[PDB]
Write a structure and sequence with these properties.
210 residues; alpha+beta; PUA domain-like; ten-stranded mixed β-sheet; 10 strands; globular; DNA-binding; ligase; Protein-DNA complex; Cell cycle; Developmental protein
Length: 210
Amino acid sequence: SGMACVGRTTECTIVPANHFGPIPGVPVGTMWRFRVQVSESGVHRPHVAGIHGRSNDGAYSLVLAGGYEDDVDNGNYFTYTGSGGRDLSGNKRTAGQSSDQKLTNNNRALALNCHSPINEKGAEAEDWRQGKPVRVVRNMKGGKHSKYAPAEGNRYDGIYKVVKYWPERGKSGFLVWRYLLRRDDTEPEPWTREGKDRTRQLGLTMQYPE
DNA sequence: CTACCGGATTGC
DNA sequence: GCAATCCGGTAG
């Protein structure tokens, strides 16, 4: 079973589970081979889910991992897809779209980060930088369609904010919730010349399980 | 390609 | 507390 059914070896105690913003001691460019490690770091606590959020508070983090065809990654911004609209019966974790997504649970959480009152028809923020921060991790499985994904594993790419969100018919013909995320982070983007230099100057290397 | 498990977390 | 959810990971 390797890493398929494993739990954490430690938990992040440096900040609590509902911390908004960067995790202390984890710079942009930090890299981990497996999602469980990303969880142990505090950067993205769920081992499987794309969004970490509480539907009455906000979303703390998300992962771009190519798991949702409606995702569109443009590096310094991206269009993210809500979760759900899927039949996971039979103890699945992933499936194709087979019903309309809903503005509930993780999807409502991420909408709350937008600097606009929550709205079932979607919203746009007049001052997007006042929104709640989202920690963004890119996983190599996004690399099928995105040149910004890391070659392997998972990489912390910094703080993004939700500019707007809206419902739209997805590629599979069912409604999906879509979110425009835009970067708001003083640290360089890992894929740029400056980001590559920073990663090197910091001595960051891929973290593997102990 | 197909099938489906633990664990972590939030929903209720 | 128990139910629901799930952008992972592996075996066949």
